[PDB]
A and B are shown apart, each in its own frame.
Chain A
């Protein structure tokens, strides 16, 4: 039961958002995921190292692994 774009989840377990993109990063090794935070609790605006993986509001883009992310819709 992996994650799908447009699904509600938690980035890092403490942050909440919606999955936008899933894949590796140009600055981090391994598999990563993109989640749009519900509030300004992120680090990027949907880009990393000059690479935009998805579109999201300012300080709403958070990049965290797929295992670190979980669906909030219990």
Chain B
């Protein structure tokens, strides 16, 4: 994965 949870 390309990392997630870095957006709001």
Please list the residues of chain A having a beta carbon within 8 angstroms of any beta carbon in chain B. Answer: 11-15, 25, 27-28, 43-44, 48, 62-65, 68
Say whether chain A's binding surface is mostly helix, strand, loop, or mixed: loop
Q: Are B2 and A13 in contact (CB under 8 A)?
A: yes
Size of chain B's interface in residues, with CB distance under 8 A? 6
Across chains A and B, the number of contacting residue pairs, with CB separation under 8 Å, is: 26
Please list the residues of chain B having a beta carbon within 8 angstroms of any beta carbon in chain A. Answer: 2-4, 6-8
Q: Are A28 and B8 in contact (CB under 8 A)?
A: yes
Given A14-B4, A43-B8, A65-B7, 5 additional A-B pairs, CB 8 A: A11-B7, A15-B7, A27-B8, A62-B8, A68-B6
* Closest 7 pairs between A and B when the two form their complex, measured CB to CB: A64-B7, A12-B7, A63-B8, A68-B6, A13-B2, A43-B8, A62-B7
